[PDB]
């Protein structure tokens, strides 16, 4: 119950969303192949 | 036998270059702890 919370640029905003989603995705991904590319752990 | 051949804004090239030092920061960091964390390979 507390918005606009932020005291920096309009920037800082879409800087910290790539951030968040990439990361996810940057493990996801490398994981995904990586993981995919071993298959030594029983496949649920 | 002619790579790069992209003629996108300039701002193409910045969103390149943070995704990659993103992505191995992410692995870096998600593995440096994970991995420290667990502590379960090479013991002294």
């Known amino acids: 119950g507390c ?10 905003s879409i800087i910290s969303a790539v951030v968040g989603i990439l990361l996810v995705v940057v493990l996801g991904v490398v994981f995904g192949i990586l993981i995919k590319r071993r298959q030594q752990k029983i496949r649920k």
């Open 3 to 12: 918005p606009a919370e932020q005291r920096a640029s309009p920037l800082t």
